[PDB]
Coordinates of C-alpha atoms and ligand atoms in Angstrom, one line a residue:
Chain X
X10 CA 0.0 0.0 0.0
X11 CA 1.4 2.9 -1.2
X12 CA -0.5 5.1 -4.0
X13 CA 1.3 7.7 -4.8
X14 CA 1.7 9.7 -8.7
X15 CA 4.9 10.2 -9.9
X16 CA 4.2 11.9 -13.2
X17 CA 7.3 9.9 -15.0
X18 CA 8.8 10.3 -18.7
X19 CA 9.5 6.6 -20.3
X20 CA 11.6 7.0 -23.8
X21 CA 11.8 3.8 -26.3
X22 CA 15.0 3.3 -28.5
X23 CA 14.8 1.1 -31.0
X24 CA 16.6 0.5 -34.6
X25 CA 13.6 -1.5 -35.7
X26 CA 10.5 0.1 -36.4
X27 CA 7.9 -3.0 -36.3
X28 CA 9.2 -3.5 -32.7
X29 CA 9.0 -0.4 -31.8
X30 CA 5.2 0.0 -33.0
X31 CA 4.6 -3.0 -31.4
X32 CA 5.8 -2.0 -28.0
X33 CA 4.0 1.4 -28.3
X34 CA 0.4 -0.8 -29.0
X35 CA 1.2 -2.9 -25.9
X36 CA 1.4 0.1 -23.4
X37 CA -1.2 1.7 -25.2
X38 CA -2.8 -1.6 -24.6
X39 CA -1.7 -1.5 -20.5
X40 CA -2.8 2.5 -19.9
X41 CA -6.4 1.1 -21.8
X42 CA -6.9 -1.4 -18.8
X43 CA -5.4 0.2 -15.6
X44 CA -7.0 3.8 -16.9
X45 CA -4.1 5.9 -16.9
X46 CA -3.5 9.3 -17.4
X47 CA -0.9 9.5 -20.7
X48 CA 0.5 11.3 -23.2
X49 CA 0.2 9.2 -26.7
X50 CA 3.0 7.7 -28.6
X51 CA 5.1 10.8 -29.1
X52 CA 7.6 10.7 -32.2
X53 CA 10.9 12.1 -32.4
X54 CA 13.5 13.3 -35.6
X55 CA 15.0 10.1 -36.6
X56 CA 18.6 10.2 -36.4
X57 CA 20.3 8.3 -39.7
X58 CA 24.0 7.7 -38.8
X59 CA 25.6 7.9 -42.1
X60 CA 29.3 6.5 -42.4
X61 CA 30.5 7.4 -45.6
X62 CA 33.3 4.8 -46.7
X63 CA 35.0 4.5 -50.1
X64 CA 33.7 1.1 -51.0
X65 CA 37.6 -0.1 -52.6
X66 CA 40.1 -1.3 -49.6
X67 CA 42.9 -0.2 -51.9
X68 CA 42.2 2.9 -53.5
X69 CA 43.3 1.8 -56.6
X70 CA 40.4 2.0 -58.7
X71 CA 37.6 4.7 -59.3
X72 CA 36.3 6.9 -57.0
X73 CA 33.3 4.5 -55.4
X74 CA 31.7 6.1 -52.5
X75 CA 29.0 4.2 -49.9
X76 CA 27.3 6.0 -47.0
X77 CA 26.6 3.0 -44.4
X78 CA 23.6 4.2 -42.6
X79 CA 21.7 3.2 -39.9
X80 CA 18.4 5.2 -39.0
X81 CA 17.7 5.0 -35.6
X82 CA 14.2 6.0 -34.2
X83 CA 13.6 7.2 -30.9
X84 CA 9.6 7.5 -29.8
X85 CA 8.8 8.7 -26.2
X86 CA 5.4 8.3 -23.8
X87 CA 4.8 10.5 -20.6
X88 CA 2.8 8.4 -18.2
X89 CA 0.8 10.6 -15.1
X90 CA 0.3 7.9 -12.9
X91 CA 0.8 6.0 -9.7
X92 CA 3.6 4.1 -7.9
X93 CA 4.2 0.4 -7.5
X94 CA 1.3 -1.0 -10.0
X95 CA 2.8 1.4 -12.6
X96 CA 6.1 0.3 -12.3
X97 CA 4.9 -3.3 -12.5
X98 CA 3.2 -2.3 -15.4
X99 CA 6.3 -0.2 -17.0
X100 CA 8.8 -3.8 -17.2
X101 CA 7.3 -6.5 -18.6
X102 CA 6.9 -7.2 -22.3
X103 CA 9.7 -7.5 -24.2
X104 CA 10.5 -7.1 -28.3
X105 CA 13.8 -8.3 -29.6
X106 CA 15.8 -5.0 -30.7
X107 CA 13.7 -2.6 -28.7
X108 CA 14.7 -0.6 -26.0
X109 CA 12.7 0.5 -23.3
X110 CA 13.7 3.1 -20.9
X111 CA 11.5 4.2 -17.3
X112 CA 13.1 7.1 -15.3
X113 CA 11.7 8.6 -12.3
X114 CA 10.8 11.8 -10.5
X115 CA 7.7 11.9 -8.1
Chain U
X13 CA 59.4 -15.7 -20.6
X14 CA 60.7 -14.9 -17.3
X15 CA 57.8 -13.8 -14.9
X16 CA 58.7 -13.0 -10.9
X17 CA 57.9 -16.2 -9.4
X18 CA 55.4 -14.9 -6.8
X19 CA 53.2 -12.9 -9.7
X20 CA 52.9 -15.9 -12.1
X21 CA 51.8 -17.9 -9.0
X22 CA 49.1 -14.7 -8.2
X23 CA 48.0 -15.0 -11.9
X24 CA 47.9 -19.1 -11.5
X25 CA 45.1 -18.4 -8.9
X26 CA 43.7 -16.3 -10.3
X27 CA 42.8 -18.1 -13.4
X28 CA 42.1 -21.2 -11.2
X29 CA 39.6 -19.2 -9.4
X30 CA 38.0 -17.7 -12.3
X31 CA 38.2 -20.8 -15.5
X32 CA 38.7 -17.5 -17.7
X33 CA 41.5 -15.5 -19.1
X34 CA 41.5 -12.5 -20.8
X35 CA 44.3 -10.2 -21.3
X36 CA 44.1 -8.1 -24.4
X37 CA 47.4 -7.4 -27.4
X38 CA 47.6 -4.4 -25.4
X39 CA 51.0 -4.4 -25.1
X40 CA 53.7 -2.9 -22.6
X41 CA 50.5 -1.1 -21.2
X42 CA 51.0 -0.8 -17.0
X43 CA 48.1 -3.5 -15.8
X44 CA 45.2 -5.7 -16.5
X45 CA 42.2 -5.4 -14.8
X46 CA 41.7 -8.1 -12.4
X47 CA 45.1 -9.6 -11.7
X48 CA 47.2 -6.1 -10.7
X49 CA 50.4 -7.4 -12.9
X50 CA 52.1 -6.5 -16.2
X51 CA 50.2 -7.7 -19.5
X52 CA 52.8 -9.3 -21.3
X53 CA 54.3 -11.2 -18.5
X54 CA 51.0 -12.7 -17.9
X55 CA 50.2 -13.4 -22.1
X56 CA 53.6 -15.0 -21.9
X57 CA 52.7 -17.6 -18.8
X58 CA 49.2 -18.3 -20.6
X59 CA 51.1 -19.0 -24.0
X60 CA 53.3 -21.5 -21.9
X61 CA 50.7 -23.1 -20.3
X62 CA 48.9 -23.1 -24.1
X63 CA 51.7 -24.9 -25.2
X64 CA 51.0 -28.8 -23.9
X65 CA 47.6 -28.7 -23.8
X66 CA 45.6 -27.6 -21.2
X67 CA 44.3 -23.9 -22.3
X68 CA 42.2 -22.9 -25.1
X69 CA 43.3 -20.2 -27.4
X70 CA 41.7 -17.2 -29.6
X71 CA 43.1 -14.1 -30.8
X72 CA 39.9 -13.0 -32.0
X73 CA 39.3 -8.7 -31.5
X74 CA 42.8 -9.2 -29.9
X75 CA 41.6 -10.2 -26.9
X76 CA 43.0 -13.6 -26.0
X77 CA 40.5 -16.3 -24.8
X78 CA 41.9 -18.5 -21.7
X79 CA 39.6 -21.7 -20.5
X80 CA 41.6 -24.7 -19.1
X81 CA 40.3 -28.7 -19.9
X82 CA 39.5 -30.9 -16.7
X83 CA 43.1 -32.2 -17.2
X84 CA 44.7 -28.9 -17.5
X85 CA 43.0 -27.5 -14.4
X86 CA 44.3 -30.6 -12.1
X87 CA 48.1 -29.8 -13.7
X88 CA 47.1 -26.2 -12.2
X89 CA 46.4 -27.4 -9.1
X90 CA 49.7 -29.6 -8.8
X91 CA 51.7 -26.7 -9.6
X92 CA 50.0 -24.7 -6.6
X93 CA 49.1 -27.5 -4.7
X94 CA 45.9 -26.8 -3.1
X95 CA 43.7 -29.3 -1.3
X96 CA 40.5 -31.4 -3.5
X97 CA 37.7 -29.8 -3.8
X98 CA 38.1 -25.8 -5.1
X99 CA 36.5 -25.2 -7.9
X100 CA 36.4 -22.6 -10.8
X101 CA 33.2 -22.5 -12.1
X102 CA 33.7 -25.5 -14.7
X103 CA 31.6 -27.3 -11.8
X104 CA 28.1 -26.0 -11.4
X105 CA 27.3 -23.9 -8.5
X106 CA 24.5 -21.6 -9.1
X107 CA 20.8 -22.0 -11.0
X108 CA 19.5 -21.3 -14.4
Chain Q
X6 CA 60.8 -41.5 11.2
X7 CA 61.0 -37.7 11.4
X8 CA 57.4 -36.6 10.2
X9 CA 58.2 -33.0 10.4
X10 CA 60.9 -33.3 7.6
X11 CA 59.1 -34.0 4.0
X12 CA 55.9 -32.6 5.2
X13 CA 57.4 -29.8 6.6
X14 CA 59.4 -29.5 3.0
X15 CA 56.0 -30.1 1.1
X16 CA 54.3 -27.0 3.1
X17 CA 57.2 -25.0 2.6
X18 CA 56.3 -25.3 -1.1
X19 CA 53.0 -24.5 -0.8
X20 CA 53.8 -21.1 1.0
X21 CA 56.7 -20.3 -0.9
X22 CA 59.2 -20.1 2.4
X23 CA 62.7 -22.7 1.5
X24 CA 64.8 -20.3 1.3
X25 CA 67.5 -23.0 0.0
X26 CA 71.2 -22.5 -0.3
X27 CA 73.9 -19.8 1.7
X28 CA 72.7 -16.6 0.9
X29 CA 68.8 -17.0 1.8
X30 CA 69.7 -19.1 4.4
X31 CA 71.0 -16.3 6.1
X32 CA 68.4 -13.8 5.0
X33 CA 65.9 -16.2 6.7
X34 CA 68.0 -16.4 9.7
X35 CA 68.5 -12.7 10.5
X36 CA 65.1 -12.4 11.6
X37 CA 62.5 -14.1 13.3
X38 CA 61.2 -15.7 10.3
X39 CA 63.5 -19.1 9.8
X40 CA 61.3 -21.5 11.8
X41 CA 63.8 -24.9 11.4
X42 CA 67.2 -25.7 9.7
X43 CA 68.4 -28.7 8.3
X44 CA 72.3 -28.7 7.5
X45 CA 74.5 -31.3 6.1
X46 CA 77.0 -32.8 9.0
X47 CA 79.8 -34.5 6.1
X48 CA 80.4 -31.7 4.0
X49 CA 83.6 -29.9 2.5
X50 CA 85.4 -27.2 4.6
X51 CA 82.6 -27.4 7.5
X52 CA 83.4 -23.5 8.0
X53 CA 80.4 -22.6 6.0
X54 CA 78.1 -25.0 8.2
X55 CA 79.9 -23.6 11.5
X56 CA 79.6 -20.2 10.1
X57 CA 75.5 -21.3 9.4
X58 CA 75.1 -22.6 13.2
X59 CA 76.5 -19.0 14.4
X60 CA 73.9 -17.4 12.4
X61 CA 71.2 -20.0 14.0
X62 CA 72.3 -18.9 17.4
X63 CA 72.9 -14.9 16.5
X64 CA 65.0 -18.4 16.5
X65 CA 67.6 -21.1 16.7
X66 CA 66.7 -24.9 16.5
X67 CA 68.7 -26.9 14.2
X68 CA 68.6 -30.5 12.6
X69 CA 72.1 -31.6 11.7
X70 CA 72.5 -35.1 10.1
X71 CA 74.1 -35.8 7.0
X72 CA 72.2 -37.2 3.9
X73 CA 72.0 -34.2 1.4
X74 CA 71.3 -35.5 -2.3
X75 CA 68.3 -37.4 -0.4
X76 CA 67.2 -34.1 1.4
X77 CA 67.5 -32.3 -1.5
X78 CA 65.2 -35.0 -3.4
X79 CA 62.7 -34.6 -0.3
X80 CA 62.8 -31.0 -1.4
X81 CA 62.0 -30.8 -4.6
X82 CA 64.6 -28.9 -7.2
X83 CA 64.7 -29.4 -10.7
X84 CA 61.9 -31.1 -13.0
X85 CA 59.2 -34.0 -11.7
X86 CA 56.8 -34.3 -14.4
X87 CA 56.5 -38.4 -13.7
X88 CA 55.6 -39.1 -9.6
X89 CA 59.4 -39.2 -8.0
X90 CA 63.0 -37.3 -8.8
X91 CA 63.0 -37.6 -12.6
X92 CA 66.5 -35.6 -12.3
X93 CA 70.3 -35.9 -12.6
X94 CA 70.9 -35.5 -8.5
X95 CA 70.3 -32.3 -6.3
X96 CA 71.5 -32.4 -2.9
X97 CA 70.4 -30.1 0.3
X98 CA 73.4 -27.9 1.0
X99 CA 71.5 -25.7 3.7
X100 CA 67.7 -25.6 3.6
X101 CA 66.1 -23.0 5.8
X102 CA 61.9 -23.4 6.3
X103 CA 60.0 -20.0 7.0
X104 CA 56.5 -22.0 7.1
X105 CA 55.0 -24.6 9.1
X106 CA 51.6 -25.0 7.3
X107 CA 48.8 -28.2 9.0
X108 CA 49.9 -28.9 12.3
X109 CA 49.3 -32.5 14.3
X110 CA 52.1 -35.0 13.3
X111 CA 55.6 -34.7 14.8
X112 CA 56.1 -30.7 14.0
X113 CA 56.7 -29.7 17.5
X114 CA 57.7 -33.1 18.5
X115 CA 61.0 -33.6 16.2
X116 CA 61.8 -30.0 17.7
X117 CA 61.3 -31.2 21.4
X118 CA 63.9 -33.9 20.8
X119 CA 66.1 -31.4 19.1
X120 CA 66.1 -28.1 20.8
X121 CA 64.5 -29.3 24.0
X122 CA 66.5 -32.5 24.6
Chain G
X6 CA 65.2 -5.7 -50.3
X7 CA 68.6 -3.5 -49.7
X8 CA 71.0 -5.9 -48.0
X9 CA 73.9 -5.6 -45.2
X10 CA 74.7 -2.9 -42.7
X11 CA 77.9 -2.8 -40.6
X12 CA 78.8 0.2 -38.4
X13 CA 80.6 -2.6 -36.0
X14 CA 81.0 -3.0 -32.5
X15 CA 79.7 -6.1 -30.3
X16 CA 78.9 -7.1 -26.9
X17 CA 77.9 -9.9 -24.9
X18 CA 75.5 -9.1 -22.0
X19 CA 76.9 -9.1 -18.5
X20 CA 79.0 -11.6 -16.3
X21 CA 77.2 -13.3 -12.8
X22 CA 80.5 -13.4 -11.3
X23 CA 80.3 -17.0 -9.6
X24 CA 83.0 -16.8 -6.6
X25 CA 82.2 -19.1 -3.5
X26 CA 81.7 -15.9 -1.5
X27 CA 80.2 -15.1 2.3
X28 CA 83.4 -13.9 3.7
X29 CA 80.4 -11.2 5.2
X30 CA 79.2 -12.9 8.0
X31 CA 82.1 -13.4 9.8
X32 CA 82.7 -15.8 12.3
X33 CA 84.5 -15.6 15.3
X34 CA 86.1 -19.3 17.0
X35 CA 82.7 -20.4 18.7
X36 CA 81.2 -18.1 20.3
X37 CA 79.7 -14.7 18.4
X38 CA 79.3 -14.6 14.8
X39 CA 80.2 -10.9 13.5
X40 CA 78.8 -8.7 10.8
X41 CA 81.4 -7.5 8.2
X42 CA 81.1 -4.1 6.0
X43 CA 77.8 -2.6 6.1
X44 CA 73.9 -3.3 5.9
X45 CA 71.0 -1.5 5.9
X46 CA 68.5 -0.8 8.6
X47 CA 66.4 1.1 6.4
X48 CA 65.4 -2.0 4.9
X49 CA 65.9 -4.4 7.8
X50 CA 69.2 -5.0 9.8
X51 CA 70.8 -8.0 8.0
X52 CA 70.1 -7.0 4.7
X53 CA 74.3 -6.3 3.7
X54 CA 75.1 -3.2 1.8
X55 CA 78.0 -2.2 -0.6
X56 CA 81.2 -0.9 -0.1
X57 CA 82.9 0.9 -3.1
X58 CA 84.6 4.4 -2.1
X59 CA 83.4 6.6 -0.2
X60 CA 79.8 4.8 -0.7
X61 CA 77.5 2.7 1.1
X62 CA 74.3 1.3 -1.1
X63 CA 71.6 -1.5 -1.0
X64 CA 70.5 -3.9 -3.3
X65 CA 67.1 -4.3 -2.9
X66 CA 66.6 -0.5 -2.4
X67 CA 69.3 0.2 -5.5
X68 CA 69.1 3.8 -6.1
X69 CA 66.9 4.8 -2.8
X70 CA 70.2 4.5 -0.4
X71 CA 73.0 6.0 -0.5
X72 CA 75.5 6.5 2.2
X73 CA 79.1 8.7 2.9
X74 CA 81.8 8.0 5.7
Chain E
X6 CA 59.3 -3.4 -16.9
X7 CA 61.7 -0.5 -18.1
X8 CA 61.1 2.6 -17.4
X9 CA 62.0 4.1 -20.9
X10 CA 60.7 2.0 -23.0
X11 CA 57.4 4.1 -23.9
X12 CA 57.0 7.7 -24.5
X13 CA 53.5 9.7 -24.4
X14 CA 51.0 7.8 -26.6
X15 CA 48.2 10.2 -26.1
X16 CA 46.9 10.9 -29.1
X17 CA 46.9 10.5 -33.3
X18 CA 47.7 7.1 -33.8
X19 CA 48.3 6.1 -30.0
X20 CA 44.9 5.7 -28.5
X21 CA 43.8 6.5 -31.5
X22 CA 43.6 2.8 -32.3
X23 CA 42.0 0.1 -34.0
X24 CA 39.2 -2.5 -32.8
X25 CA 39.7 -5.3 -34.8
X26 CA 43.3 -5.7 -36.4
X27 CA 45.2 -3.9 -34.3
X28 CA 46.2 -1.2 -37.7
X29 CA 46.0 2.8 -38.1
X30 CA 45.1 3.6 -41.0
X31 CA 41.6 4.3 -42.2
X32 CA 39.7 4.9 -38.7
X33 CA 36.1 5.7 -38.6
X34 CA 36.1 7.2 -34.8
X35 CA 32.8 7.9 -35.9
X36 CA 30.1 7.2 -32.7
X37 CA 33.3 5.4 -30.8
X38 CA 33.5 2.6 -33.4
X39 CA 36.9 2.1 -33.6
X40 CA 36.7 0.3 -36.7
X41 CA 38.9 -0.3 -39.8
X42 CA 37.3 0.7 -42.8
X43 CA 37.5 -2.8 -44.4
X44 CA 36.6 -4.5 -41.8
X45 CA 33.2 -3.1 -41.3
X46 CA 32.3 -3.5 -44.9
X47 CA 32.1 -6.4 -44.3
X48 CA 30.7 -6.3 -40.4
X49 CA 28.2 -3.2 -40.6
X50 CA 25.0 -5.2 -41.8
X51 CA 25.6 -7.2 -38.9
X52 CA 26.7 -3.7 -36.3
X53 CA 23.6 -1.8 -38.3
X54 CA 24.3 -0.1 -41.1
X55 CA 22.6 -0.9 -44.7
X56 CA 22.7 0.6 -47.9
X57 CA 19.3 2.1 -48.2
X58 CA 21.3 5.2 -49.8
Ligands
ZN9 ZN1 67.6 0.4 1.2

């Protein structure tokens, strides 16, 4: 017995995008059946990290340039809600790839 | 190569304790983590021990990958002694 | 006969504390630290072991007897690889033990007959 | 590949110097045993130092003793 | 063990150094990679990167 609202930021990280959606339906999913206070499913500007590498490992040869990228997307959800349930709530289910972070303040 | 006695015993334990040696190709460097000796010193003994059997070997990332056999881990033991019955973690302790 | 002799060699080992030979000998000595000594009685010159026995006296107690190539095989110097010696020959000269290791046995016992008469 | 280079000159390493030594540690006809030269205290009294000229220094403290009489 | 056997390795090429082959030329220090150039065209599908342009 504690109940107590913390009012708590959770960000997502995830360099898979069917993951990530999926994750984002499953706490939409969780806030649906414990009635929660939230903010929805909050995009961010996808960082692409671009290496650009000259494709030849000799140099001899045209000028052949590739750009290794890797966009990464980000996606956050602000949660107003209560204490030990929530943080129950805020662990479990798990995508491979996606990254799920909970951080606190009360 | 020529290690002080007392350190290559240290290391010895060390790896008996653990059943896993790193040590990167990190050179001349002043010490590993772990085992508070000289890198090279200690790459040398692990080579030597390599040598008739005993420890397993890759230089994969440079990064050196040390796990003795059953039979190499008793030749450890001779070497320092040590009473039956201490274990690395070759035999099962915990749950999973 | 004489449990506190191989044993006491053995543990020695273990501990890192024969400090076999002159020099470490007398290192050992110097101090508190040199537990029991066993010299060779038939040697050359003898001056060396009388010069040894001074030390002792400057902890004291010491073992005399002769027998060193079979001392020096109780010790352990050179390579064993099989079970016993597996060496040309090795004899004791002057071995000095810092450690003691397991009790029980005839540790203090061999030093009562010594030292104590 | 460019071949030989001699600006001569060679060496070996360094001598042990064998002896039969311990003429330190002097002993007196039964009774007292006597310490020769010089050791350190700073180290621990039996611990011999050396003698050169108008120098007294350790071995296992090399450079860190140093002493004039 | 001797003192003079190292000078300052601080920077450049000194801890500016490879994490694979243990080489110097052609480092992408890039997000802390590390990496030869080489090497990760043939590793970066598997570290992350594609070729989607
Ligand atoms: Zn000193």
């Amino acid at each position: 017995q504690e109940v107590v609202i913390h009012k708590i930021r959770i960000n997502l990280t995830s360099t898979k995008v069917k993951q990530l959606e999926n994750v984002s339906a499953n706490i939409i999913k969780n806030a649906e059946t414990f009635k929660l206070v939230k903010k929805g499913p909050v995009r961010l500007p996808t960082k692409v990290l671009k290496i650009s590498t000259r494709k030849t490992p000799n140099g001899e040869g045209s000028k052949t340039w590739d750009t290794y990228e890797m966009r990464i997307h980000k996606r956050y959800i602000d949660l107003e809600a209560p204490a030990h349930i929530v943080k129950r709530i805020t662990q479990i289910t798990i995508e491979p790839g996606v990254d799920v972070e909970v951080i606190i303040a009360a | 190569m020529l290690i002080p006695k007392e350190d290559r015993k240290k290391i010895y334990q060390h790896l008996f304790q653990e059943g896993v040696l790193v040590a990167k190709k990190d050179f001349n460097q002043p010490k590993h983590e772990e085992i508070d000796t000289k890198n090279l010193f200690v790459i040398k003994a692990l080579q030597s021990l390599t040598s008739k059997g005993f420890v397993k070997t890759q230089f994969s990332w440079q990064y050196y990958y040390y796990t003795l056999t059953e039979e190499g881990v008793v030749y450890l033991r001779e070497y320092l002694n040590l009473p039956e019955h201490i274990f690395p973690a070759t035999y099962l302790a915990g749950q999973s | 006969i004489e449990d506190a002799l191989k044993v006491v060699l053995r543990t020695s080992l273990v501990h890192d504390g024969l400090a076999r030979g002159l020099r470490e000998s007398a290192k050992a000595l110097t101090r508190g630290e040199g537990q029991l000594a066993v010299l060779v009685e038939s040697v050359t010159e003898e001056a060396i072991s009388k010069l040894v026995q001074g030390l002792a006296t400057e902890n004291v107690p010491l073992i005399k007897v002769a027998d060193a190539k079979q001392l020096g095989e109780w010790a352990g110097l050179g390579k064993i690889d099989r079970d016993g010696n597996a060496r040309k020959v090795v004899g004791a000269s002057v071995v000095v033990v810092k450690n003691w290791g397991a009790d029980t046995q005839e540790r203090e016992i061999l030093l009562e007959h010594f030292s104590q008469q | 590949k460019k071949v030989y280079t001699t600006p001569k000159k060679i060496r070996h390493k360094h001598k042990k110097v064998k002896l039969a030594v311990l003429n330190y540690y002097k002993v007196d006809d039964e009774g007292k045993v006597a310490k020769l030269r010089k050791e350190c205290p700073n180290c621990g009294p039996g611990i011999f130092l050396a003698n050169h000229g108008d120098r007294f220094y350790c071995g296992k403290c090399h450079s860190t003793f140093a002493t004039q009489k | 063990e001797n003192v003079w056997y190292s000078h300052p390795r601080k920077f450049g090429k000194g801890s500016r150094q490879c994490r694979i082959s243990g080489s110097h030329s052609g480092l992408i220090r890039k997000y802390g990679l590390n990496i030869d150039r080489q090497s990760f065209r043939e590793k970066a599908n598997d570290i992350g990167f594609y070729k989607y342009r």
